[PDB]
Design a protein around this ligand. Structure first.
Ligand code: FWG
Ligand code: FWG
Ligand code: FWG
Ligand code: FWG
Ligand code: IMP
Ligand code: IMP
Ligand code: IMP
Ligand code: IMP
Lengths: 331, 331, 331, 331
């Protein structure tokens, strides 16, 4: 084997990230303004804009969830707070009209009680929220939830980075599979644990397991430009989950921070020391971006342009677009 | 598939840009001073120097077009101004002697009226000027123009980045095909839309569709050194269109700008916020370079050297030169 | 041959280093806190933590060796000092309880006398400590030691970077093979001699020769993050030897250095001019890190996380994990 | 074709430079101090140290040539000066004992008269000194010289970067072939003309044409570390020509320059504007390095280390060593 040893499976794949590829233009009759940006968040729930906000305590509380839903997407309420408080945020969102909202749960002992309280509060989507879903306890939580509240609530499972992991969540009954182990902007898992999977390759692999079963893939983490959203969907994802890109907005939790005459907001990993109080995230800053509505408009504008270039009238068509792989020189 | 999924066509190609390749020397009897630099701009029009200036409002108005033609190349007048004004610039160039000149038109409603006014003003080349020519409206404009004014005016279509797109323009009747989706120095399409195609690969693909029909390819965008002009022609292009390399010249529109004791001129994308008033270009600065005549001399000097090294007595011979692909270490 | 010449064996392999790969997650029932981190240092000696400290005079003297053993690993006492002094450090470690300790010897004339003095002092592991073990004098020293004191003392040989070299040490009777020619943080062999072998590939190759004979591989050099320890073990190593990561600790030799308001300690190659008094190492600084116990806890924490992600209940299982190769864009 | 077009020969090779490869250690009985560093400069002339100084006016005049010969290598006197003056420098070197010396000639009209004057002055090696030897005028000069003064003087031809070019010089009668089109530290040919060939690949290709005819290859340009000398010889070169590495020495032409409290010397391309008075070189600075004797000692020390690691008792053995290719991450 050219890279060493005698086992060709030891190095299993060549992993591409977003910066490794570009979308190829294709024959087009599609005007960006007329493209249909709607897409499946789960088997049953279709969003007008294929974007959801991360379940992080510097990204999504009630204010963000409301703004995301109004913009045509959805928020996923973080779970780094008491059950009663998270449930009250669900109620707060549902009081602001017929707005979709999701909420994160874990797989701990209090996870089941948290999920039932969220159901009682009227939540539409429960996100079983882990860093590694390929695990009996996670698969069991997904299955138990689906069998118990599945008629009324859609159950998302994640995160995965391999085909087999995605397959396991599908068999467990997930209504959507969330992809991303290691790609987050504030992630240190790759240097702390040495574990990860570049996100374009991870999406391609997850989609190979989910699409034949009609299960939507959520691309979670590593998106830094509006162009990355188009790439994620073209790789086969149905929606993208965003942390860093939304953390700088007025609707995100937290105050403005002034450093060197410039405005920022804090953005921290849920695995950072601060969030937990062996960290796998950092605490950082992102530039202040203004209102969420305007950020979403710019992000969707980029996606619409990609749909024009690729001749994709719908997200389903964009999922069939082709890539070109680029070199380092294509900085 | 090593990069993910089960579909080998999902990632269609490995895209090389100019920095990825070098020209290999070959047996030579050619002195740089004696090389013939003439090349086809279109099926009928041959230039003494294979260079045209970009149709941008910080690069080509009448003064630039006149200087380019005198230097043996051609200018393409930008269209970010009223029809009457653009037509008056055509007249101004034709009044300065028997000088070749081209002018950009769009595919909007006013595009046809613009084209006829340019024809009346005496224009030699009409450039159907879009970011994505693989589109019924663009192909129809090219065809209508060719059938209507084709005997007197050469019609250029662009831009394309794929073989099929170039083929479609050829069938539509284009007299030259312009290549470049995403490579421009001031371009943000790659980060906004996630769309693009590295330019050496794009030229190779376009040429595979155009050369068998005797249609010249114009390499448009991403050229930053005189050496890139040689590479573009060796990949099979017949001419190169330059923006950044000519924007710093005395003949370009705009004033000198002094920052930190150094001289610059503004250079902005036609898709920048400033030009349009979702932007796909930026507004920037380029160093002031002095007279156009001298810049062209230096650029052509580099091309002549390449022709000496490769034993290319003509541009047609240079189009048959070979490359070596380099690694990152070859910075 | 695509890279030149007619001999496909001239460029023998594509060498990967730690930054070239990530560990893929796999099905897991393993809790990080419950993972078994024990591993073979040699055929007979198993450590609770698979880490040993480098035999360098800015890393391991008696204080470090004691702390490493207490933390569940081991120290290898450097040999840049008189035989009597090194032997006294062995005694000092053994006086602090039933603590494992190793000590470096060379292959010079005084090497044999040094080894016997270390044996008399009660050493558990002798490390035949060279930059290139594939050499008759090194193989002879390993063999002589094994045959003479092998019943009481384990003999480590190194360093190697190729399969054949590792094979030769195995046949010579080594109880463990140490891998690393050129990867050290303070190493200049790669620029001075142009010699080296990227460490993931070197480990894969050494393991292919050692594992079928039941001989553990020690990955030595180039480890800069806790994640690199997981990668080294997953490539097939049984332990990792650390220099830079431990040189900043309270237990390492040397004083604190203050530069620009920040605390550092000196860290220098044993091939640096300072250590020898043609250098193949530099003298540098590393940040002060505090107590060794805490550094080891953080390093092992990272390893435990990797074992959770990969479903590895033991180091033997981690050695069967798979990689994904990443590109430059995966910075 | 994956990179574009339908012609697999368009991109002819993947070109490696020195930074792309490392030498693999191999079984060794060779002590660095005992390695034989002698090598053929030409078919007849063997040097004790396989190094020659560049024919540049900031590197080699009489003082450098004398010092190089005394160190066991050779200097090649530059030709950017009157014939009488260059010839007087030859005389000056021969007056300092039985010291080998070479001198550069061109292929212009005055080239023949220059060569005869150098022969009369007692020169040992004539270097036909061009940037592209694959040319009838260069091949004719080599042949004419060999047939006219070949019994007394060795004739070097260069530069080449391809197998066919090297073959042509061999057939012309060259006693050594010099390799390097574009790799020089002060070279801008790659950005001006877009022409070049990475040096490890260029050496491998030239050697494939020269070695079967017993003609030594001189690796010229791009060497920045002592380790690059080992790599060049291992790729099959017999000697290396150095510019930048020797330009900082006391024996090089020019004065010391003080900038920001540090000592430098000027180093400029023979194709720089300053040397010619379309430039293909720059004028730069290199750090002051002290006496040549000491620089050579350090360079040879590195080579000796490489010979120890690779088990090469002679340069002929080193030419049979193997490489490993490294990635970008192996910075
Ligand atoms: O429960 C774990 C264990 C994972 C399973 C394997 C054993 C290691 C621990 N966590 C807790 C959550 N995360 S995280 O907050 O950083 C995280 C949050 C969501 C998405 C992630 C995607 N990739 C990395 C980290 C992510 C860290 C690790
Ligand atoms: O009309 C469009 C639409 C393109 C078709 C697909 C839908 C998206 C919009 N424009 C308008 C012009 N450009 S541009 O000015 O930036 C532009 C000018 C010329 C050459 C380009 C080459 N590559 C990128 C941008 C370029 C932006 C996009
Ligand atoms: O004895 C030698 C000879 C090596 C054999 C081939 C001939 C060259 C000399 N030494 C002495 C020790 N080292 S070192 O201290 O830098 C060193 C220490 C341990 C691990 C090394 C791993 N890779 C590089 C250097 C290393 C330098 C060279
Ligand atoms: O005579 C030429 C022509 C070359 C043949 C093809 C046509 C172009 C001109 N020169 C003159 C010398 N050089 S140089 O001084 O820069 C030069 C000096 C030696 C080694 C070189 C190696 N690679 C690049 C430049 C080098 C520049 C070009
Ligand atoms: O602490 C952490 N370490 C690693 N990943 C995290 C952490 N916290 C959240 N994440 C994940 O990173 C995603 C956000 O990534 P981003 O959009 O690139 O910032 C989130 O939706 C999580 O999947
Ligand atoms: O705003 C923009 N975004 C992307 N491409 C542009 C824009 N404006 C002009 N272009 C194209 O970029 C070319 C100039 O590229 P440059 O020579 O690299 O600066 C132009 O000829 C256009 O094809
Ligand atoms: O001077 C030197 N040059 C090259 N390698 C060295 C030198 N001194 C020690 N080493 C090796 O580098 C290892 C430490 O590497 P590190 O952990 O990356 O700093 C040591 O255990 C040695 O194998
Ligand atoms: O002006 C120039 N441009 C390109 N190459 C040059 C020039 N002048 C000298 N050279 C070549 O560069 C070699 C020195 O390269 P260096 O050792 O990397 O600095 C010289 O021996 C020449 O072959």
């Amino acid at each position: 084997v050219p890279t060493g040893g005698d086992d060709p499976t030891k190095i299993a794949m060549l992993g591409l990230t977003f910066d490794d590829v570009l979308l190829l233009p294709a024959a087009s009759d599609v005007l960006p303004a007329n493209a249909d940006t709607s897409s499946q968040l789960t088997k049953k729930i279709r969003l007008k804009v294929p974007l959801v906000s991360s379940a992080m305590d510097t990204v999504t509380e009630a204010r963000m969830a409301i703004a995301m839903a109004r913009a045509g997407g959805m928020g996923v309420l973080h779970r780094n707070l008491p059950v009663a408080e998270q449930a009250a945020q669900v109620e707060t969102v549902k009081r602001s009209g017929g707005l979709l909202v999701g909420a994160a749960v874990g797989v701990g002992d209090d996870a089941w009680e948290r999920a039932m309280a969220l159901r009682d509060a009227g939540v539409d989507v429960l996100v079983v929220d882990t860093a590694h879903a390929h695990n009996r306890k996670v698969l069991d939580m997904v299955h138990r939830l689906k069998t118990t509240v599945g008629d009324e609530i859609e159950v998302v499972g994640g995160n995965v980075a391999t085909r087999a992991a995605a397959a396991a969540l599908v068999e467990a009954g997930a209504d959507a599979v969330k992809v991303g182990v290691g790609p987050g902007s504030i992630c240190t898992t790759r240097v702390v644990a040495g574990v990860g999977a570049p996100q374009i390759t991870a999406i391609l692999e997850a989609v190979a397991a989910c699409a034949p079963h009609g299960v939507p893939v959520i691309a979670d983490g590593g998106l830094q430009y509006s162009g990355d959203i188009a790439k994620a969907l073209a790789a086969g994802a149905s929606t993208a989950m965003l942390g860093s890109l939304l953390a700088g907005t007025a609707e995100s939790p937290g105050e403005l921070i002034l450093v060197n005459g410039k405005q920022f907001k804090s953005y921290r990993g849920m695995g950072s020391l601060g969030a937990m109080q062996v960290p796998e995230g950092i605490e950082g800053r992102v530039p202040f971006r203004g209102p969420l509505s305007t950020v979403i408009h710019q992000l969707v504008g980029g996606l619409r342009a990609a749909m024009g270039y690729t001749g994709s009238a719908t997200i389903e068509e964009l999922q069939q677009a082709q890539f070109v792989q680029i070199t380092a020189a294509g900085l």
